[PDB]
């Protein structure tokens, strides 16, 4: 109970401003980046489990799952990857300077394509193209479940999780989509962009659709 | 944190034994009863909201939703009805003698059909036909979210909810299905039985299916 606030490294809060206020037209690349991160966290736990099998027991199923929640205008990208501890959330998701942050921005300025973001190692923030608020719910075998939240301001909060479903292991990227990005709540659109830029994913990508029984 | 244990009224733990160990063949009637209860809790909040509109604000959408969770061999029936407080869970779901409990059993003995259960006012326990463990996660506007759990023994537990997703208002019936009742995790089967016995439900019945993107 009760959150802790942290300030974002100055260049990182710069990137977010840049991304959130970026009339860019190829916004669909955010799914590519998030699915890509999901697959990377699944690789880690798998590789890591090569000499530590028990690590898998917390969730034997390796997968990636997208769940749109229309009523809340939310879209969630989930994975049963290695997950992150509270330290790593605070550490890697905000307070510590990141290698490619400044470079990408300059590249972006020189006319670079926003889809290069992933090549600069800061693709997670691409999510701010379609969303104006996000929660990173994560659970690592080495710690408890926590919620990392941000609205692209200058500070972010980390809270012990007591309000969300329990994920065996992994992360959930809960994106509160912009009022004009609701198209990513639609099954067709989602399926469309997953096929366009995510053909070589090694884990099953599951889409959760809700339908009224006729 | 930390659960409280309660004993079941003696006749009620009798009914459960009777139901769980009942070779009956028309087990699909459990969905009828649970959907029926869902629709009843939705009626209450609606009616009740006739003179207390704000009561709806906690969850403006009236609906019923079934979500099978294969990996956990779980099936959930959810509704955004009036929900129940901790008192009512302890009170109405176990400790207080119920009017039709003894009568149904006798009727069942005289050769009655198990699907009459709902007519005796004890249809909730029909769920024990396909499941051997259940959790009633509920949240009423008049209280906090709690988890009521049972395995058909002689006692049940009520715990303040800190491990499940937050439901605006309503109840979730999390049924841990029997090893031979997994057929209710299948979309076809589910859709089949909903159409068979639940044609006159006034609220949208939503089915949540998970599928791998081709
Ligand atoms: C090759 O490694 C990658 C890294 C290094 C990273 C910090 C190491 C990290 O340690 C804490 C874990 O190894 C790893 C399991 C987790 C993630 C990918 C997360 O994905 C999920 N589902 O867990 C993502 O979660 C919202 C979090 C931060 C990502 C940043 C700032 C980014 O923008 N780009 C990157 C993409 C990568 O794949 C990146 O920097
Ligand atoms: C006409 O009223 C009904 C009652 C009276 C009942 C105790 C009053 C109750 O007060 C606490 C609320 O008014 C009501 C909102 C909630 C429910 C139906 C629940 O459904 C959900 N989704 O909330 C069900 O939840 C697992 C709980 C207990 C049910 C029992 C023991 C039963 O087996 N049969 C009955 C079916 C009914 O519809 C029944 O007895």
From Swiss-Prot, chains A, B:
Outcome of mutating residue 22 to I? Induces a 6-fold increase in ATPase activity and a reduced client protein activation activity, leading to growth defect at high temperatures
Name what induces it.
Expressed constitutively and induced by high temperatures dependent on transcription factor HSF1. According to PubMed:2674684, it is constitutively expressed at low levels, however, due to the specificity of the antibody, this result is unsure.
Q: Where in the cell is it found?
A: Cytoplasm
Q: Where is the signal peptide?
A: none
| Effect after changing residue 97 to I | Abolishes interaction with SBA1
User: Which annotated residues bind ATP?
Assistant: 33, 37, 79, 84, 92, 98-100, 119-124, 171
- Give the result of residue 107 to N, as annotated: Induces a 6-fold increase in ATPase activity
> Miscellaneous notes for this chain?
Present with 444943 molecules/cell in log phase SD medium.
Q: How does it assemble?
A: Homodimer. Interacts with the co-chaperones AHA1, CDC37, CNS1, CPR6, CPR7, HCH1, SBA1, SSE1 and STI1. CNS1, CPR6, CPR7 and STI1. Interacts directly with the substrates GCN2, HAP1 and STE11.
Domain comment as written in the entry: The TPR repeat-binding motif mediates interaction with TPR repeat-containing proteins like the co-chaperones AHA1, CDC37, CNS1, CPR6, CPR7, HCH1, SBA1, SSE1 and STI1. CNS1, CPR6, CPR7 and STI1.
Q: What is this protein called?
A: ATP-dependent molecular chaperone HSP82
Q: Which organism is it from?
A: Saccharomyces cerevisiae (strain ATCC 204508 / S288c)
């Amino acid at each position: 109970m009760a959150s802790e606030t942290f300030e974002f490294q100055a260049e990182i809060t710069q990137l977010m401003s840049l991304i959130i206020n970026t009339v860019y037209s190829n916004k669909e690349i955010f799914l590519r980046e998030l699915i890509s991160n999901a697959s990377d966290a699944l690789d880690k736990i798998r590789y890591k489990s090569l000499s530590d099998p028990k690590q898998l027991e917390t969730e034997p199923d390796l997968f990636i799952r997208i769940t749109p929640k229309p009523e809340q205008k939310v879209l969630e990208i989930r994975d049963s990857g290695i997950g992150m501890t509270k330290a790593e959330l605070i550490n890697n998701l905000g307070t510590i300077a990141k290698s490619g942050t400044k470079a990408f921005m300059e590249a972006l300025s020189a006319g670079a394509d926003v889809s290069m973001i992933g090549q600069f190692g800061v693709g997670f923030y691409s999510l701010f193209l379609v969303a104006d608020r996000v929660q990173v719910i994560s659970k690592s075998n080495d710690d408890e479940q926590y919620i990392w939240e941000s609205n692209a301001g200058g500070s972010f909060t980390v809270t012990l999780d007591e309000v969300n479903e329990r994920i065996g292991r992994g992360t959930i990227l809960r994106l509160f989509l912009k009022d004009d990005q609701l198209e990513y709540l639609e099954e067709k659109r989602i399926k469309e962009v997953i096929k366009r830029h995510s053909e070589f994913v090694a884990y099953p990508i599951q889409l959760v659709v809700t339908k009224e029984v006729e």
